[PDB]
Amino acid sequence: NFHPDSEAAINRQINLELYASYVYLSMAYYFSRDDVALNNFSRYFLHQSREETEHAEKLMRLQNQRGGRIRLQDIKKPEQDDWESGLHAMECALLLEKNVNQSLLELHALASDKGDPHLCDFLETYYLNEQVKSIKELGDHVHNLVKMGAPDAGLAEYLFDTHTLG
Amino acid sequence: NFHPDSEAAINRQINLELYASYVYLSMAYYFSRDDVALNNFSRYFLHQSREETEHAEKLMRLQNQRGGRIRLQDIKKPEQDDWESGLHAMECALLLEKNVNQSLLELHALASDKGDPHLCDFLETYYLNEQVKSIKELGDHVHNLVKMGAPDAGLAEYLFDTHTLG
Amino acid sequence: NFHPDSEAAINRQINLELYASYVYLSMAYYFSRDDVALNNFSRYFLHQSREETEHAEKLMRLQNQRGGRIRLQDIKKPEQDDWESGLHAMECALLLEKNVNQSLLELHALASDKGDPHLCDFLETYYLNEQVKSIKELGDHVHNLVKMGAPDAGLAEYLFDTHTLG
Amino acid sequence: NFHPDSEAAINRQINLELYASYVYLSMAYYFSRDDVALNNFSRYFLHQSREETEHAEKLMRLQNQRGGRIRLQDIKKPEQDDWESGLHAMECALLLEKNVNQSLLELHALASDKGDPHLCDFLETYYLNEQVKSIKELGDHVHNLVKMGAPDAGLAEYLFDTHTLG
Amino acid sequence: NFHPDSEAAINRQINLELYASYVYLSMAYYFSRDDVALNNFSRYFLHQSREETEHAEKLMRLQNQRGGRIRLQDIKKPEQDDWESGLHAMECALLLEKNVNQSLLELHALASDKGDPHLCDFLETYYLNEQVKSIKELGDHVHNLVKMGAPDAGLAEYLFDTHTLG
Amino acid sequence: NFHPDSEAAINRQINLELYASYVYLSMAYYFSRDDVALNNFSRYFLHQSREETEHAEKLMRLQNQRGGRIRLQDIKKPEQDDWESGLHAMECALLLEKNVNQSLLELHALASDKGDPHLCDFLETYYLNEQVKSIKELGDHVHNLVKMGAPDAGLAEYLFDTHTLG
Amino acid sequence: NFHPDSEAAINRQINLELYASYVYLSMAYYFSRDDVALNNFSRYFLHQSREETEHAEKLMRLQNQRGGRIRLQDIKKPEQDDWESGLHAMECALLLEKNVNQSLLELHALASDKGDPHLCDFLETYYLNEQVKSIKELGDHVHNLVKMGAPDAGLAEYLFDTHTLG
Ligand SMILES: [Cl-]
Ligand SMILES: [Cl-]
Ligand SMILES: [Cl-]
Ligand SMILES: [Cl-]
Ligand SMILES: [Cl-]
Ligand SMILES: [Cl-]
Ligand SMILES: [Cl-]
Ligand SMILES: [Cl-]
Ligand SMILES: [Cl-]
Ligand SMILES: [Cl-]
Ligand SMILES: [Cl-]
Ligand SMILES: [Cl-]
Ligand SMILES: [Cl-]
Ligand SMILES: [Cl-]
Ligand SMILES: [Cl-]
Ligand SMILES: [Cl-]
Ligand SMILES: [Cl-]
Ligand SMILES: [Cl-]
Ligand SMILES: [Cl-]
Ligand SMILES: [Cl-]
Ligand SMILES: [Cl-]
Ligand SMILES: [Cl-]
Ligand SMILES: [Cl-]
Ligand SMILES: [Cl-]
Ligand SMILES: [Cl-]
Ligand SMILES: [Cl-]
Ligand SMILES: [Cl-]
Ligand SMILES: [Cl-]
Ligand SMILES: [Cl-]
Ligand SMILES: [Cl-]
Ligand SMILES: [Cl-]
Ligand SMILES: [Cl-]
Ligand SMILES: [Cl-]
Ligand SMILES: [Cl-]
Ligand SMILES: [Cl-]
Ligand SMILES: [Cl-]
Ligand SMILES: [Cl-]
Ligand SMILES: [Cl-]
Ligand SMILES: [Cl-]
Ligand SMILES: [Cl-]
Ligand SMILES: [Cl-]
Ligand SMILES: [Cl-]
Ligand SMILES: [Cl-]
Ligand SMILES: [Cl-]
Ligand SMILES: [Fe+3]
Ligand SMILES: [Fe+3]
Ligand SMILES: [Fe+3]
Ligand SMILES: [Fe+3]
Ligand SMILES: [Fe+3]
Ligand SMILES: [Fe+3]
Ligand SMILES: [Fe+3]
Ligand SMILES: [Fe+3]
Ligand SMILES: [Fe+3]
Ligand SMILES: [Fe+3]
Ligand SMILES: [Fe+3]
Ligand SMILES: [Fe+3]
Ligand SMILES: [Fe+3]
Ligand SMILES: [Fe+3]
Ligand SMILES: [Fe+3]
Ligand SMILES: [Fe+3]
Ligand SMILES: [Fe+3]
Ligand SMILES: [Fe+3]
Ligand SMILES: [Fe+3]
Ligand SMILES: [Fe+3]
Ligand SMILES: [Fe+3]
Ligand SMILES: [Fe+3]
Ligand SMILES: [Fe+3]
Ligand SMILES: [Fe+3]
Ligand SMILES: [Mg+2]
Ligand SMILES: [Mg+2]
Ligand SMILES: [Mg+2]
Ligand SMILES: [Mg+2]
Ligand SMILES: [Mg+2]
Ligand SMILES: [Mg+2]
Ligand SMILES: [Mg+2]
Ligand SMILES: [Mg+2]
Ligand SMILES: [Mg+2]
Ligand SMILES: [Mg+2]
Ligand SMILES: [Mg+2]
Ligand SMILES: [Mg+2]
Ligand SMILES: [Mg+2]
Ligand SMILES: [Mg+2]
Ligand SMILES: [Mg+2]
Ligand SMILES: [Mg+2]
Ligand SMILES: [Mg+2]
Ligand SMILES: [Mg+2]
Ligand SMILES: [Mg+2]
Ligand SMILES: [Mg+2]
Ligand SMILES: [Mg+2]
Ligand SMILES: [Mg+2]
Ligand SMILES: [Mg+2]
Ligand SMILES: [Mg+2]
Ligand SMILES: [Mg+2]
Ligand SMILES: [Mg+2]
Ligand SMILES: [Mg+2]
Ligand SMILES: [Mg+2]
Ligand SMILES: [Mg+2]
Ligand SMILES: [Mg+2]
Ligand SMILES: [Mg+2]
Ligand SMILES: [Mg+2]
Ligand SMILES: [Mg+2]
Ligand SMILES: [Mg+2]
Ligand SMILES: [Mg+2]
Ligand SMILES: [Mg+2]
Ligand SMILES: [Mg+2]
Ligand SMILES: [Mg+2]
Ligand SMILES: [Mg+2]
Ligand SMILES: [Mg+2]
Ligand SMILES: [Mg+2]
Ligand SMILES: [Mg+2]
Ligand SMILES: [Mg+2]
Ligand SMILES: [Mg+2]
Ligand SMILES: [Mg+2]
Ligand SMILES: [Mg+2]
Ligand SMILES: [Mg+2]
Ligand SMILES: [Mg+2]
Ligand SMILES: [Mg+2]
Ligand SMILES: [Mg+2]
Ligand SMILES: [Mg+2]
Ligand SMILES: [Mg+2]
Ligand SMILES: [Mg+2]
Ligand SMILES: [Mg+2]
Ligand SMILES: [Mg+2]
Ligand SMILES: [Mg+2]
């Protein structure tokens, strides 16, 4: 029981998860630049990158298990190589995770229309809550950074780096 | 002491390592397809993918350490999604690793011309021998698979999967 | 296989490493002054001093191993006894390490011209990367200190001392 | 109690054992070639090489203990550098070990004629049975390889490599 | 990327390392003669012999890894069977190691001309420093033995044997 | 309670301790020369060098604790780079330690005149007895070396190196 | 299967082994004399005495096992009570062990003539090699002692006692 629009949509989500992994990887190595040097922001985003790779692998295994055929696409480069500040990176990540969430919600609605409860359950089990938690955590971080005066307050990002992300 | 052609070439190698990671990832999930089902070929290529990601990260850290600026590019999709057979995948990997090697050798020669012994040493230390070992190992595997009659001999790939890659 | 210009240059590097050790020692005891009292800056620079002594000893052992004759020179005093601030000391260290690096690069180029691959390898193995890492780390520290408002912001150096150098 | 023909014959056996060591070393590195890649054949022959070196050292110690003078000779190269197949190498080894055995039997007969029971006992204790066991084991291996269809059956040597020599 | 002059030169070095192994083996069993009986000189040279065999095996593995073909030659006998004294053996070893070093330096220069950085790095990593250390250690031993009055001073070699080589 | 002549004198002693450290370092690497090769003399003098660095650091901490200002000077090179023999080095060290002792005694007398019991106690606690013990130990060593016939007796320094300094 | 000449010859060897035990016992207590005082020579010879007693007991058990009748004889006193020097004792022991060896070889030849392979094997297993090793070891010791200048060099025997026999 597996539709072609479903196979295709899963393949599209695979690519999106790999893109998310790459964005986070880009931010991780931005924050270990010599003129940024926020080593816990770096570690934070590196860990998120690795999570996103696992998100992609889970969908690839789903595709294999349902007898679909994985069709990989180019992984697009992140839209910035200078992420400007710890606050700006967090805000960009929050938007990324909200766009990923809405793609997952779209995929869920497609699965519901197709009467594919196995795909709905897979998404609900592995993706939808983790996305909500991600979105909440990034939102938390953005709020704290703004309240502390980032990015122009000289100490906000340094102190956020050593305590919250430490 | 860091040239712009050098920075650029390192960025090009970063992208190539990420491409290699993606090729191996593609082969890993080909071999767990229901009409392939060579689970040790899958594990083998998955491990190689993860190594290639580390190869890319080491160059990104080098770029940061030398004060260069990482400039990421799209990661191109692998040229096949059906890798046809365990032998064909191994042959395709051997070619990939030889092309990666020749790009690394080109980068080494650029570094030598630029009088950048730190970059030469980095490459020699982390890349050139691992590439030779990789190339040798894949060559070993290709030879064994051909000698056993792959891919048309029904038992060659199954038995290679359970013993050599087990 | 060992040239006299090579022996001489190694002796010059020995002296430079011992000078670097002395500079760091001077900064270590500046920061435990009663009107400075940044005890983790002190510990940081003391550790760097001890590393530099080991850098000098490794070259002395190289000289002995190659059958050269160690010729020691006066170790010059550091150019300041009041290092003014945690930021100023870090900036002065970064410059010192860049000058040491360029002396090591000069020695490497001399060894290459002399066809002395043992000396090239020794330098590449023990010196060139450690210098790049040092330079990067000091650069990181300088950037963080400036961003936090050092030296005139009353809390920047205190907080850098307790977190980054803690 | 030690004859000159005896001293000379022991010296000749020393050289023969060292030759055997070298043959096995040659076969070990043949089987780790990229177009052979039988890593357990390689390990097997490498272990035999090391045994043969010990066989030579025991006779050198005997020579020293009896007050004879060790007179070393050139160690001849093995007669092939391409050993052609796992079966052909095993057959060549069996012949080598039979020729070594017959040289040891000749030495034993010389010792018996000379009334040198210490040399007879040394040979019987350390050499003659190990040779018979070697010859039997190689014969076992040759028989199994032929029965399985080596070298032209694509799987015989691979499977012998992974099970018998694993 | 592997030249025929390179393959040939590596094969020549293999043979030279095996020759060095044999020289040391010859000296080891000289010093356990009943009219020499310097059992720590014996152990010392025996250990050096085993190291040299490993030096040869590393180059054989390099040859296999680069896709070259190992071509073994006769291993020549050492030029003496009576090494005359502990001092004379040490002096002969120092010369051997200097000749081996110069052959390795020649091979390095060949690799540099051929633009083969993998071979340069292999040599620098595994051979050139060990040779310098060897040469220094043997030189140390020769100097101590001469200063103590060897070989004609009845106690020099005995005492060197029990303390330095003990 | 801290005089300017006192601050100055402590600074002069700091420099003298650092000079002593450097002399010992010079002797340590003399005795690991290939034409000296007395590795326990080397270790002995290396340990003394490290002690002298600690002697200097203790006075720097004293200066900081009393609110004085450390003023570092050039560290002069040792007066010899060829220390000639194990006996000559020991004799030169004994003289160095006696000159350091007399400088410490001078500093103590200055402190007594200034009514600075904290400085007197510091010196008595950390310096004066260690100096007497040092002087006695070096004197012991010199006496033994002369009695054994150093430096011209071929075995005196070798045997002193392996037993007393072992 | 046991001849009377064989029984008799074994009885003669028993007595010879007991004589050897007594000689060594005599030398052991010579070297603990107050005007000799070489306590490791003493321990060495005492251990050899105990070995010789075991050599005699093994032949007595052989005699009992073969159904022969042990016929003991007087144990003659050693031919000296003043063994003169550590070198002279070692030389006297070497001669004793060579005479014991030749008696054992004579017994072996008798057994061979009598077609008594059990007695030949007993001798070869327990006696002939131990004798060769003994003879070699004593020869080693004699050579070292002469080379060091014994007995007239005041330090040769003392130093041999503390190192070789320690
Ligand atoms: Cl899967
Ligand atoms: Cl695409
Ligand atoms: Cl950008
Ligand atoms: Cl911003
Ligand atoms: Cl923003
Ligand atoms: Cl900020
Ligand atoms: Cl980094
Ligand atoms: Cl791009
Ligand atoms: Cl395809
Ligand atoms: Cl295929
Ligand atoms: Cl194909
Ligand atoms: Cl197949
Ligand atoms: Cl199995
Ligand atoms: Cl050294
Ligand atoms: Cl100077
Ligand atoms: Cl100043
Ligand atoms: Cl400042
Ligand atoms: Cl400044
Ligand atoms: Cl501040
Ligand atoms: Cl031996
Ligand atoms: Cl020959
Ligand atoms: Cl051939
Ligand atoms: Cl064949
Ligand atoms: Cl054949
Ligand atoms: Cl086969
Ligand atoms: Cl290999
Ligand atoms: Cl040849
Ligand atoms: Cl000779
Ligand atoms: Cl000589
Ligand atoms: Cl000579
Ligand atoms: Cl001697
Ligand atoms: Cl302090
Ligand atoms: Cl000054
Ligand atoms: Cl001098
Ligand atoms: Cl002198
Ligand atoms: Cl003097
Ligand atoms: Cl001396
Ligand atoms: Cl019994
Ligand atoms: Cl009687
Ligand atoms: Cl007597
Ligand atoms: Cl005598
Ligand atoms: Cl005598
Ligand atoms: Cl004596
Ligand atoms: Cl001693
Ligand atoms: Fe996680
Ligand atoms: Fe995700
Ligand atoms: Fe996400
Ligand atoms: Fe791995
Ligand atoms: Fe790679
Ligand atoms: Fe690769
Ligand atoms: Fe460190
Ligand atoms: Fe340094
Ligand atoms: Fe440094
Ligand atoms: Fe805190
Ligand atoms: Fe074995
Ligand atoms: Fe053998
Ligand atoms: Fe054999
Ligand atoms: Fe199996
Ligand atoms: Fe070793
Ligand atoms: Fe070697
Ligand atoms: Fe060597
Ligand atoms: Fe100490
Ligand atoms: Fe001192
Ligand atoms: Fe001192
Ligand atoms: Fe001793
Ligand atoms: Fe015993
Ligand atoms: Fe006996
Ligand atoms: Fe005996
Ligand atoms: Mg994709
Ligand atoms: Mg996360
Ligand atoms: Mg793009
Ligand atoms: Mg873009
Ligand atoms: Mg539902
Ligand atoms: Mg549900
Ligand atoms: Mg979830
Ligand atoms: Mg996330
Ligand atoms: Mg937060
Ligand atoms: Mg890229
Ligand atoms: Mg791999
Ligand atoms: Mg594309
Ligand atoms: Mg394509
Ligand atoms: Mg290198
Ligand atoms: Mg590598
Ligand atoms: Mg690989
Ligand atoms: Mg294989
Ligand atoms: Mg200097
Ligand atoms: Mg450091
Ligand atoms: Mg100055
Ligand atoms: Mg100045
Ligand atoms: Mg380094
Ligand atoms: Mg540093
Ligand atoms: Mg920092
Ligand atoms: Mg020979
Ligand atoms: Mg064997
Ligand atoms: Mg030949
Ligand atoms: Mg031939
Ligand atoms: Mg046997
Ligand atoms: Mg064998
Ligand atoms: Mg078999
Ligand atoms: Mg050869
Ligand atoms: Mg060695
Ligand atoms: Mg020859
Ligand atoms: Mg010759
Ligand atoms: Mg190089
Ligand atoms: Mg290099
Ligand atoms: Mg090396
Ligand atoms: Mg060596
Ligand atoms: Mg020495
Ligand atoms: Mg000073
Ligand atoms: Mg001391
Ligand atoms: Mg001066
Ligand atoms: Mg001077
Ligand atoms: Mg007191
Ligand atoms: Mg004291
Ligand atoms: Mg001292
Ligand atoms: Mg003393
Ligand atoms: Mg009796
Ligand atoms: Mg014994
Ligand atoms: Mg009597
Ligand atoms: Mg008598
Ligand atoms: Mg037997
Ligand atoms: Mg025996
Ligand atoms: Mg005995
Ligand atoms: Mg001895």
PDB file of all heavy atoms in Angstrom, chain A residues 32 34-37 154-155 158 163, chain C residues 136 140 143-144 147-148 160 163-164:
ATOM      1  N   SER A  32      33.097  28.831  14.859  1.00  0.00           N
ATOM      2  CA  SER A  32      34.506  28.592  15.180  1.00  0.00           C
ATOM      3  C   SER A  32      35.464  29.411  14.305  1.00  0.00           C
ATOM      4  O   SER A  32      36.684  29.147  14.283  1.00  0.00           O
ATOM      5  CB  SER A  32      34.793  27.112  15.069  1.00  0.00           C
ATOM      6  OG  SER A  32      34.505  26.674  13.769  1.00  0.00           O
ATOM      7  N   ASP A  34      37.756  32.640  13.505  1.00  0.00           N
ATOM      8  CA  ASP A  34      38.595  33.423  14.421  1.00  0.00           C
ATOM      9  C   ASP A  34      37.993  34.773  14.785  1.00  0.00           C
ATOM     10  O   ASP A  34      38.348  35.327  15.833  1.00  0.00           O
ATOM     11  CB  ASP A  34      40.024  33.608  13.844  1.00  0.00           C
ATOM     12  CG  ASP A  34      40.065  34.365  12.502  1.00  0.00           C
ATOM     13  OD1 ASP A  34      39.110  35.084  12.153  1.00  0.00           O
ATOM     14  OD2 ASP A  34      41.094  34.217  11.781  1.00  0.00           O
ATOM     15  N   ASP A  35      37.077  35.310  13.978  1.00  0.00           N
ATOM     16  CA  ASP A  35      36.402  36.564  14.294  1.00  0.00           C
ATOM     17  C   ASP A  35      34.970  36.329  14.755  1.00  0.00           C
ATOM     18  O   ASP A  35      34.120  37.206  14.624  1.00  0.00           O
ATOM     19  CB  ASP A  35      36.430  37.516  13.097  1.00  0.00           C
ATOM     20  CG  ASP A  35      35.723  36.959  11.885  1.00  0.00           C
ATOM     21  OD1 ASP A  35      35.287  35.795  11.933  1.00  0.00           O
ATOM     22  OD2 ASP A  35      35.620  37.693  10.879  1.00  0.00           O
ATOM     23  N   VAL A  36      34.698  35.145  15.301  1.00  0.00           N
ATOM     24  CA  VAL A  36      33.406  34.846  15.895  1.00  0.00           C
ATOM     25  C   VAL A  36      33.644  34.144  17.217  1.00  0.00           C
ATOM     26  O   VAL A  36      33.278  34.666  18.274  1.00  0.00           O
ATOM     27  CB  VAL A  36      32.522  33.985  14.978  1.00  0.00           C
ATOM     28  CG1 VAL A  36      31.192  33.717  15.666  1.00  0.00           C
ATOM     29  CG2 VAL A  36      32.348  34.634  13.629  1.00  0.00           C
ATOM     30  N   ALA A  37      34.223  32.933  17.150  1.00  0.00           N
ATOM     31  CA  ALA A  37      34.833  32.265  18.299  1.00  0.00           C
ATOM     32  C   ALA A  37      33.828  32.066  19.430  1.00  0.00           C
ATOM     33  O   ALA A  37      34.090  32.391  20.585  1.00  0.00           O
ATOM     34  CB  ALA A  37      36.048  33.059  18.789  1.00  0.00           C
ATOM     35  N   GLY A 154      28.014  43.654  24.059  1.00  0.00           N
ATOM     36  CA  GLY A 154      29.241  42.881  23.932  1.00  0.00           C
ATOM     37  C   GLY A 154      29.240  41.572  24.703  1.00  0.00           C
ATOM     38  O   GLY A 154      29.989  40.657  24.350  1.00  0.00           O
ATOM     39  N   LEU A 155      28.447  41.477  25.778  1.00  0.00           N
ATOM     40  CA  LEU A 155      28.477  40.289  26.607  1.00  0.00           C
ATOM     41  C   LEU A 155      27.345  39.290  26.377  1.00  0.00           C
ATOM     42  O   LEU A 155      27.478  38.155  26.839  1.00  0.00           O
ATOM     43  CB  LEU A 155      28.484  40.668  28.078  1.00  0.00           C
ATOM     44  CG  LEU A 155      29.748  41.375  28.554  1.00  0.00           C
ATOM     45  CD1 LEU A 155      29.354  41.955  29.894  1.00  0.00           C
ATOM     46  CD2 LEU A 155      30.901  40.450  28.723  1.00  0.00           C
ATOM     47  N   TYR A 158      28.425  36.064  24.329  1.00  0.00           N
ATOM     48  CA  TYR A 158      29.462  35.359  25.082  1.00  0.00           C
ATOM     49  C   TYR A 158      28.846  34.632  26.277  1.00  0.00           C
ATOM     50  O   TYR A 158      29.139  33.453  26.533  1.00  0.00           O
ATOM     51  CB  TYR A 158      30.567  36.318  25.546  1.00  0.00           C
ATOM     52  CG  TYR A 158      31.646  35.631  26.364  1.00  0.00           C
ATOM     53  CD1 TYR A 158      32.670  34.898  25.732  1.00  0.00           C
ATOM     54  CD2 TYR A 158      31.676  35.730  27.756  1.00  0.00           C
ATOM     55  CE1 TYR A 158      33.669  34.273  26.473  1.00  0.00           C
ATOM     56  CE2 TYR A 158      32.686  35.089  28.493  1.00  0.00           C
ATOM     57  CZ  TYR A 158      33.671  34.378  27.850  1.00  0.00           C
ATOM     58  OH  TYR A 158      34.674  33.760  28.578  1.00  0.00           O
ATOM     59  N   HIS A 163      26.843  29.740  29.306  1.00  0.00           N
ATOM     60  CA  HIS A 163      25.907  29.151  30.238  1.00  0.00           C
ATOM     61  C   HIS A 163      24.837  28.295  29.579  1.00  0.00           C
ATOM     62  O   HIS A 163      24.818  27.075  29.786  1.00  0.00           O
ATOM     63  CB  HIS A 163      25.241  30.218  31.045  1.00  0.00           C
ATOM     64  CG  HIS A 163      26.170  30.993  31.904  1.00  0.00           C
ATOM     65  ND1 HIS A 163      26.716  32.190  31.531  1.00  0.00           N
ATOM     66  CD2 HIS A 163      26.681  30.703  33.118  1.00  0.00           C
ATOM     67  CE1 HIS A 163      27.457  32.655  32.525  1.00  0.00           C
ATOM     68  NE2 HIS A 163      27.462  31.761  33.490  1.00  0.00           N
TER      69      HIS A 163
ATOM     70  N   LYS C 136      45.511  30.698  16.051  1.00  0.00           N
ATOM     71  CA  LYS C 136      44.046  30.738  15.965  1.00  0.00           C
ATOM     72  C   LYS C 136      43.445  30.975  17.355  1.00  0.00           C
ATOM     73  O   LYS C 136      42.541  31.796  17.519  1.00  0.00           O
ATOM     74  CB  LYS C 136      43.509  29.452  15.332  1.00  0.00           C
ATOM     75  CG  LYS C 136      41.951  29.234  15.421  1.00  0.00           C
ATOM     76  CD  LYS C 136      41.189  30.125  14.500  1.00  0.00           C
ATOM     77  CE  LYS C 136      39.758  29.655  14.363  1.00  0.00           C
ATOM     78  NZ  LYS C 136      39.061  29.473  15.703  1.00  0.00           N
ATOM     79  N   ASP C 140      41.146  33.943  18.564  1.00  0.00           N
ATOM     80  CA  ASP C 140      39.836  33.739  19.171  1.00  0.00           C
ATOM     81  C   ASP C 140      39.704  34.594  20.436  1.00  0.00           C
ATOM     82  O   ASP C 140      38.706  35.301  20.647  1.00  0.00           O
ATOM     83  CB  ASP C 140      39.617  32.262  19.559  1.00  0.00           C
ATOM     84  CG  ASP C 140      39.341  31.337  18.380  1.00  0.00           C
ATOM     85  OD1 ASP C 140      39.332  31.794  17.220  1.00  0.00           O
ATOM     86  OD2 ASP C 140      39.089  30.135  18.647  1.00  0.00           O
ATOM     87  N   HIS C 143      39.484  38.322  19.830  1.00  0.00           N
ATOM     88  CA  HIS C 143      38.193  38.729  19.291  1.00  0.00           C
ATOM     89  C   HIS C 143      37.135  38.787  20.393  1.00  0.00           C
ATOM     90  O   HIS C 143      36.381  39.749  20.493  1.00  0.00           O
ATOM     91  CB  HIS C 143      37.716  37.766  18.211  1.00  0.00           C
ATOM     92  CG  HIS C 143      36.273  37.972  17.856  1.00  0.00           C
ATOM     93  ND1 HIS C 143      35.868  38.863  16.887  1.00  0.00           N
ATOM     94  CD2 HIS C 143      35.142  37.472  18.415  1.00  0.00           C
ATOM     95  CE1 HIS C 143      34.544  38.864  16.830  1.00  0.00           C
ATOM     96  NE2 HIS C 143      34.081  38.034  17.752  1.00  0.00           N
ATOM     97  N   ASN C 144      37.032  37.732  21.192  1.00  0.00           N
ATOM     98  CA  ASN C 144      36.067  37.705  22.297  1.00  0.00           C
ATOM     99  C   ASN C 144      36.288  38.875  23.247  1.00  0.00           C
ATOM    100  O   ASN C 144      35.337  39.563  23.644  1.00  0.00           O
ATOM    101  CB  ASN C 144      36.211  36.373  23.037  1.00  0.00           C
ATOM    102  CG  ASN C 144      35.415  35.237  22.366  1.00  0.00           C
ATOM    103  OD1 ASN C 144      35.965  34.171  21.974  1.00  0.00           O
ATOM    104  ND2 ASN C 144      34.103  35.430  22.308  1.00  0.00           N
ATOM    105  N   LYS C 147      35.090  42.101  21.622  1.00  0.00           N
ATOM    106  CA  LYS C 147      33.633  42.144  21.491  1.00  0.00           C
ATOM    107  C   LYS C 147      32.997  42.415  22.846  1.00  0.00           C
ATOM    108  O   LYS C 147      32.009  43.157  22.942  1.00  0.00           O
ATOM    109  CB  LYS C 147      33.132  40.839  20.858  1.00  0.00           C
ATOM    110  CG  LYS C 147      31.657  40.484  20.974  1.00  0.00           C
ATOM    111  CD  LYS C 147      31.456  38.997  21.289  1.00  0.00           C
ATOM    112  CE  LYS C 147      29.979  38.627  21.589  1.00  0.00           C
ATOM    113  NZ  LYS C 147      29.573  38.553  23.028  1.00  0.00           N
ATOM    114  N   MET C 148      33.582  41.860  23.912  1.00  0.00           N
ATOM    115  CA  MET C 148      33.002  42.093  25.221  1.00  0.00           C
ATOM    116  C   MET C 148      33.304  43.480  25.780  1.00  0.00           C
ATOM    117  O   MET C 148      32.792  43.821  26.853  1.00  0.00           O
ATOM    118  CB  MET C 148      33.415  41.054  26.273  1.00  0.00           C
ATOM    119  CG  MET C 148      33.154  39.589  25.957  1.00  0.00           C
ATOM    120  SD  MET C 148      34.369  38.420  26.616  1.00  0.00           S
ATOM    121  CE  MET C 148      33.923  38.391  28.332  1.00  0.00           C
ATOM    122  N   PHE C 160      35.864  36.907  31.094  1.00  0.00           N
ATOM    123  CA  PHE C 160      36.698  36.062  30.235  1.00  0.00           C
ATOM    124  C   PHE C 160      37.627  35.187  31.079  1.00  0.00           C
ATOM    125  O   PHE C 160      37.881  34.006  30.768  1.00  0.00           O
ATOM    126  CB  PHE C 160      37.536  36.925  29.266  1.00  0.00           C
ATOM    127  CG  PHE C 160      38.180  36.121  28.164  1.00  0.00           C
ATOM    128  CD1 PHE C 160      37.445  35.743  27.038  1.00  0.00           C
ATOM    129  CD2 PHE C 160      39.497  35.737  28.260  1.00  0.00           C
ATOM    130  CE1 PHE C 160      38.027  34.985  26.016  1.00  0.00           C
ATOM    131  CE2 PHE C 160      40.082  34.963  27.229  1.00  0.00           C
ATOM    132  CZ  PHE C 160      39.346  34.612  26.122  1.00  0.00           C
ATOM    133  N   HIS C 163      35.445  32.262  32.750  1.00  0.00           N
ATOM    134  CA  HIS C 163      34.819  31.262  31.914  1.00  0.00           C
ATOM    135  C   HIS C 163      35.743  30.673  30.860  1.00  0.00           C
ATOM    136  O   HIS C 163      36.070  29.482  30.930  1.00  0.00           O
ATOM    137  CB  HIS C 163      33.617  31.833  31.235  1.00  0.00           C
ATOM    138  CG  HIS C 163      32.541  32.254  32.167  1.00  0.00           C
ATOM    139  ND1 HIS C 163      32.391  33.538  32.613  1.00  0.00           N
ATOM    140  CD2 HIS C 163      31.579  31.526  32.772  1.00  0.00           C
ATOM    141  CE1 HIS C 163      31.318  33.605  33.385  1.00  0.00           C
ATOM    142  NE2 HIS C 163      30.821  32.393  33.507  1.00  0.00           N
ATOM    143  N   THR C 164      36.221  31.502  29.923  1.00  0.00           N
ATOM    144  CA  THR C 164      37.039  30.947  28.850  1.00  0.00           C
ATOM    145  C   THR C 164      38.312  30.338  29.421  1.00  0.00           C
ATOM    146  O   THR C 164      38.629  29.190  29.157  1.00  0.00           O
ATOM    147  CB  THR C 164      37.344  32.004  27.795  1.00  0.00           C
ATOM    148  OG1 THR C 164      36.090  32.402  27.219  1.00  0.00           O
ATOM    149  CG2 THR C 164      38.263  31.462  26.686  1.00  0.00           C
TER     150      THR C 164
END
